[PDB]
Design a protein around this ligand. Structure first.
Ligand SMILES: [Ca+2]
Ligand SMILES: [Ca+2]
Ligand SMILES: [Ca+2]
Lengths: 360, 346, 53
């Protein structure tokens, strides 16, 4: 009891939707050609990081009043240090094949993003705003802008750089932010005021890596895709775009996207929109959330790490350690290493040099 | 009886059938017809009508908005610019019940531009503030907020406010729709951030303030919205306009928005800048937008069963009944029997 | 106001600050425009004989 297919008018075809719902639907098993698409959001962390606090939640997505100390050295408080936002999405664990030494792994291909709440900025009638002139309206949110987001299978690697090492950031033992001297274990030097390879860290926590200290490391971030921009000025305007037709492709020059190591998706962002010119003349920054629409798929990859050697590390018996003289690092005690493979015709110099600069 | 060889070849352009006003929509067309609609949307800046002679002088403007200076804030409706919206009632179409398919409208492309850009060079408004002594008036400049949207269902909004302390006017019939109007409870500091619970659909015209509501990117799968902003005290207003520009509405899969309910929904809002008065006060200003939507007929498949579909209609046509109970609590039914087929007496 | 429309008849007699190209009716003509509104906002302009439209 079915109609003739030649009679039916042609109709286009589209990707078949199987499931739509909350995060619970990630535990659904799927075929190999399936495609998963996650929509989430991240509120900004501008020092005031929670509305549930009874006392000081009135300035959520804001910052306590910013102003220089006037006397060396600077001693800023946690609230005046905007920090990156970050979150992890626990993806479902996929299949693996031992006999081929291969395994599926989640790959991100495209993300759709836009800043939410842009239209809120036209509020020129906040009661404590600073009027541009007598009997006029206030000065809308404008000035400094720092926009940045990143997606990858690893936590975002990042580099440290400070405008002035003289600053004494709040101590970490209070559970607060993480500055450079927390990582290095020693006070910063003028080196840290420029680039310092010693100063590196991975984006572990939310609201604890101040933006004015840490910047994304372009070297190590190879399994992640980060985009950013800046705009610094007294009252420079806030220019922003938003639409749902813009899609950004995350694929690389090899045609592969970020690989979700550990069956986890790592997302991070931060958006500063400008100051809030209070009537008293004080200032305070403001931030807005971001909407993320990650498009994921399944890719087959070879297992790079030997299984047995891994578990061997976990046992003290099969991986004995010793607190001996240094054989790695700056003070290593290995004078030379030579690696031979195969055979060739006899060279005329056992002290082979490879650099023309070395002949002198 | 003409001679084909004698006559020169002429190009082939799409054939026009009918041209006119809204009454055109009632005509019947074929499967491959294409329809264009040209319309406009006046802005809504708190002053939302010219017909009332009491205060219509400040049409497309606000009432001299400025900060109070003392907590809390009690802004008035006429300082709350809101989105514009309208619905076009499209006609009914054909279907093929045998193949369980049918056709509904889709938007494929919209041509648009702002109207009245040229009127901004009026730097001689009699109460416009001079830039300096014996100078000329300060032109319309400052804050801008432009957006427009085309979709088959009304635009889905997201609520976010610069200050939850700001208490908005009570939602009197014909008033502004704010956060606490939706939730039924006073706002919390979360609303200064993102709150998934504070969502709403763009119901009415000129009642959804812009400084509160923003287009929800998740829920809006069936409409296309574009937007921009610049926030400056006196930053200039740059605007372009032409009729050669056209924006495609097709998605990744090559399908536009589908007009659910045989009607397309559109929304727009264009803040153009401040108006500086000699007294020093400041007020915003807007301009209309011209929309030229190109529509076609697309075949689609019915995903829902008919029996569940028809009862829904009956659910709406006949009113709910609050009668004596017949549910398991205190049922007033005492016995139920069911017979199926013949048999022998026990 | 759709009542207020008019064709561009004469020179020097149609104030810019009053009239704008009706988007709906100009279907047999191509028009391009811009604007820049400020007190002392600089004037940026470009010119060449290589570009065409
Ligand atoms: Ca590298
Ligand atoms: Ca969605
Ligand atoms: Ca026309």
């Amino acid at each position: 009891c079915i109609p003739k297919p030649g009679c039916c008018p042609n109709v286009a075809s589209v990707p078949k939707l199987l499931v739509k719902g909350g995060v619970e639907v990630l535990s659904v098993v799927t075929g190999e050609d399936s495609i998963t698409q996650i929509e989430l959001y991240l509120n900004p962390r501008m020092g005031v990081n929670s509305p549930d606090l009874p006392t000081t939640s009135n300035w959520y997505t804001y910052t306590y009043d910013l102003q220089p100390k006037g006397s060396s050295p600077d001693q800023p408080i946690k609230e005046n240090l905007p920090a990156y936002s970050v979150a992890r999405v626990s993806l479902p664990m996929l299949n693996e094949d031992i006999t081929c030494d291969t395994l599926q792994m989640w790959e991100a291909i495209s993300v759709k993003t836009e800043v939410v709440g842009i239209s809120s900025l036209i509020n020129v009638h906040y009661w404590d705003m600073k009027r541009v002139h007598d009997y006029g309206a206030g000065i809308p949110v404008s000035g400094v802008n720092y926009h940045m987001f990143a997606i990858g299978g690893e936590p975002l690697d990042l580099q440290g750089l400070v405008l002035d090492y003289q600053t004494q950031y709040p101590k970490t033992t209070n559970g607060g932010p993480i500055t450079i001297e927390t990582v290095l274990g020693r006070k910063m030097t003028p080196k840290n005021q420029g680039l310092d390879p010693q100063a590196k860290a991975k984006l572990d926590k939310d609201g604890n890596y101040p933006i004015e200290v840490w910047c994304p490391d372009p070297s190590k971030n190879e399994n992640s895709r980060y985009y950013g921009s800046i705009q610094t000025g007294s009252q420079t305007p806030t220019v922003l775009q938003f639409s749902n037709t813009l899609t950004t492709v995350l694929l690389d020059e090899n045609g592969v996207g970020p690989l979700c190591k550990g069956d986890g998706l790592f997302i991070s962002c931060a958006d500063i929109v400008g100051f809030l010119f209070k009537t008293s003349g004080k200032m305070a920054l403001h931030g807005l959330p971001r909407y993320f629409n990650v498009t994921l798929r399944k890719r087959w990859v070879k297992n790079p790490y030997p299984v047995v050697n891994l578990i061997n590390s976990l046992f003290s018996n099969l991986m004995p350690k010793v607190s001996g003289q240094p054989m790695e690092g700056k003070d290593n005690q290995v004078e030379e290493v030579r690696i031979y493979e195969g055979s060739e015709q006899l060279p005329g110099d056992p002290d082979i040099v490879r650099f023309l600069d070395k002949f002198g």
